[PDB]
Structures are given as C-alpha cells and as structure tokens.
C-alpha cells in the first residue's frame, strides 16, 4: 500500500497539482515525484555514489553532486 503519496520533507508546492515546485522546490529524500526530482546518474550505474540510477530511485533530495 506504500509508494503512493508524498514525504514529510515535501513542500506545499509539491502537494499541489500541477507540481508548483517548478519555481519553489525544497523536497527531501521521501519524494519520488519526477516533476521536481531530477538525476544525472544513468541506468548503467550510479555516478554520485548514493546508489541511484535516475529520479526513480534517487534518494538524493537535491543539492547533491548528481543535481
Ligand atoms: Cd515532494
Ligand atoms: Cd513534486
Ligand atoms: Cd518538489
Ligand atoms: Cd548517484
Ligand atoms: Cd541521483
Ligand atoms: Cd546524488
């Protein structure tokens, strides 16, 4: 049942639709919302070292090397 929803570190912007984090993002790790989450690590392997391969499994809540 888990996997649907937002995290505690989500913004009031991410909790709006559409995602208002386009100009106001501060979401933490508990956010798999690709609307505000972006990543540079590729599917062949993690590049930053947080063990992530894209926003689909990016633990990083921005402000990281792969950001
Ligand atoms: Cd969020
Ligand atoms: Cd979002
Ligand atoms: Cd956000
Ligand atoms: Cd990474
Ligand atoms: Cd990442
Ligand atoms: Cd990272």
Query: DSSP characters for 3-41?
Result: TSS--TT--TTTTSSS-GGGS-----SS---TTT-----
Residue in this structure with the two tokens 């709006």, named with its chain if needed: 16
Q: Which two tokens mark 29?
A: 């790790």
Q: CB count, 10 Å around CB of 18?
A: 8
Closest CA to 33 of 2, 63, 61, 67: 61
Residues 36 and 2: their CA atoms lie apart, in Å, by 20
Look at residue 34 and tell me if it is in a domain.
Answer: yes
Cα(21) to ligand 5 centroid in Å equals 18
- Give just the sign of the alpha carbon dihedral 19, 23, 26, 32: positive
Report whether 55 contacts 35 (CB < 8 A).
Answer: no
Look at residue 1 and tell me if it is in a domain.
Answer: no
> How many domains does the chain contain in total?
1
Q: Which two tokens mark 63?
A: 């402000």
Which of the 8 DSSP states describes residue 61?
-
Which of the 8 DSSP states describes residue 52?
-
- Parent domain of 27: 7-62
Q: How far is CA 8 from CA 45, 50, 63, in A?
A: 28, 20, 18
Cα(36) to ligand 3 centroid in Å equals 4
Cα(15) to ligand 5 centroid in Å equals 22
2 is in an annotated binding site: no
């Amino acid at each position: 049942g888990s996997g649907k929803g937002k995290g505690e570190k989500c913004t009031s912007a991410c909790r709006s639709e559409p995602c208002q984090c386009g100009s106001k993002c501060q979401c933490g790790e508990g956010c798999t919302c690709a609307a505000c989450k972006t990543c540079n690590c590729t599917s062949d392997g993690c590049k930053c070292g947080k063990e992530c391969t894209g926003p689909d499994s990016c633990k990083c809540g921005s402000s990281c090397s792969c950001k």
